């Protein structure tokens, strides 16, 4: 039938999305604890650092899809791309990012994440330098809607097509069903050049998460469903790993069972 109904429920639910609560829920401890090497934060950072460390993912332009109020997903990326586009559906998230870009004190503090990224990249970089570079290389923060065939709109500011895409915890968190998820992946895929790379991180078998007042409906996906959608979109899957959420990190902020990381390269 049609996609409007579910898409409309999603947009409606996000009107209540609270950036600070979401940051607290997922990026403050225990989930944001970077000392525990078995924690989810360290694993996410590690997937990104190792992928970029192959030297196989480079270019001039990078687009981060559904950045929300977070930047950790770009810490290892930023040394490999000189032009970075960050994006989100919600103005309030885009402002949160604005706060970090201006280095305001009222901003969320990512320095543990910056430090940790420096630590595992193994180049002796201080975190203030990593941050300075991320801030310099973010060239724009744009509204985005992945349900649109042109997710950035027509006549986008963004350099297109990009050399690479990053997207963490977006697609499954905004798609009422798997077919919607697939279409979203198809949409963002039009922004990536052939032979370009997508780094996709996401929730496994999740149906809801909390962001303050907002309780959001997530399509629960399996690793295998993630693989097939990537193939369906015209990628070769180069890496797909799974982290199983330990019980102690199951805090009632969501019903997440695990997290996936895909490295995929667009065929062409």
Ligand X SMILES: Nc1ncnc2c1ncn2[C@@H]1O[C@H](CSCC[C@H](N)C(=O)O)[C@@H](O)[C@H]1O
Residue 185 contact, options ligand RCO, ligand X, its own copies, none, Cβ 5-8 Å cut-off depending on partner type: none
| Residue 77: both structure tokens together | 């990326």
Ligand-binding site membership of 235 (annotated): no
| Residue 40: both structure tokens together | 């989810």
Residue 209 contact, options ligand X, ligand RCO, its own copies, none, Cβ 5-8 Å cut-off depending on partner type: ligand RCO
Residue 254 contact, options its own copies, ligand X, ligand RCO, none, Cβ 5-8 Å cut-off depending on partner type: ligand RCO
Q: Residue 113 interacts with ligand X (CB under 6 A)? A: no
Please identify, among the stretches 53-61, 82-90, 131-139, 192-200, the one whose residues bind ligand X according to the rule CB under 6 A: 82-90
Residue 109 contact, options ligand RCO, ligand X, its own copies, none, Cβ 5-8 Å cut-off depending on partner type: none
CA dihedral sign of residues 46, 51, 57, 63: negative
User: Which of 23, 90, 203, 219 is the binder for ligand RCO (CB under 6 A)?
Assistant: 203
Please identify, among the stretches 35-43, 155-163, 168-176, 254-262, the one whose residues bind ligand X according to the rule CB under 6 A: 168-176
Q: Which long-range contacts (C-beta less than 8 Å, at least 24 apart) are formed by 236-241? A: 236/264, 236/265, 236/267, 237/262, 237/263, 237/264, 238/263, 238/264, 238/265, 239/51, 239/263, 241/47
Find tokens 């994006």 and name the residue: 87
Q: Which is nearer to ligand RCO, 3 or 217 (CB)?
A: 217
Residue 119 contact, options ligand X, its own copies, ligand RCO, none, Cβ 5-8 Å cut-off depending on partner type: its own copies
Percent composition of the chain: helix, strand, coil (DSSP 3-state, to 5): 40, 25, 40
Q: Where are the beta strands (DSSP E) in the chain?
A: 61-65, 83-88, 138-143, 162-168, 192-204, 208-211, 214-217, 235-244, 258-266
DSSP label of 254: B
Shortest distance in whole angstroms from residue 201 CB to ligand X: 7
Shortest distance in whole angstroms from residue 215 CB to ligand RCO: 12
Residues annotated in a binding site:
22, 27, 66-67, 72, 88, 93, 145-146, 168, 206, 254
């Amino acid at each position: 039938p049609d996609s409007a109904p579910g898409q409309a429920a999603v947009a409606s639910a996000y009107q209540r999305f609270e950036p600070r609560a979401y940051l607290r829920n997922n990026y403050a401890p225990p989930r944001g604890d970077l000392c525990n090497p078995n924690g989810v934060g360290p694993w996410k950072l590690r997937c990104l650092a190792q992928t970029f460390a192959t030297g196989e993912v480079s270019g001039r332009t990078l687009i981060d899809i559904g950045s929300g109020p977070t930047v950790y997903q770009l810490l290892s990326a930023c040394s490999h791309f000189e032009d970075i586009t960050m994006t989100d559906f919600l103005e309030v998230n885009r402002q949160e990012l604005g706060r970090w870009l201006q280095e305001e004190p009222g901003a969320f503090n990512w320095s543990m994440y910056s430090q940790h990224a420096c630590l595992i990249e193994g180049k002796g970089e201080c975190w203030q330098d990593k941050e300075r570079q991320l801030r310099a290389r973010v060239k724009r923060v744009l509204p985005i809607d992945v349900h649109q065939p042109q997710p950035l709109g027509a006549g986008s500011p963004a350099p297109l097509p990009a050399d690479a895409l990053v997207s963490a915890f977006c697609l499954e968190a905004v798609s009422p069903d798997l077919a919607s998820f697939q279409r979203a992946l198809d949409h963002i895929t039009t922004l990536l050049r052939p032979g370009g790379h997508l780094l996709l991180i996401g929730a496994l078998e999740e149906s809801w998460y909390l962001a303050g007042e907002a309780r959001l409906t997530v399509v629960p996906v399996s690793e295998e469903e993630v693989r097939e959608a990537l193939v369906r979109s015209g990628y070769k899957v180069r890496d797909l790993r799974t982290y199983i959420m330990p019980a102690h990190l199951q805090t009632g902020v969501d019903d997440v069972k695990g997290v996936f990381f895909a490295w995929a390269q667009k065929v062409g």
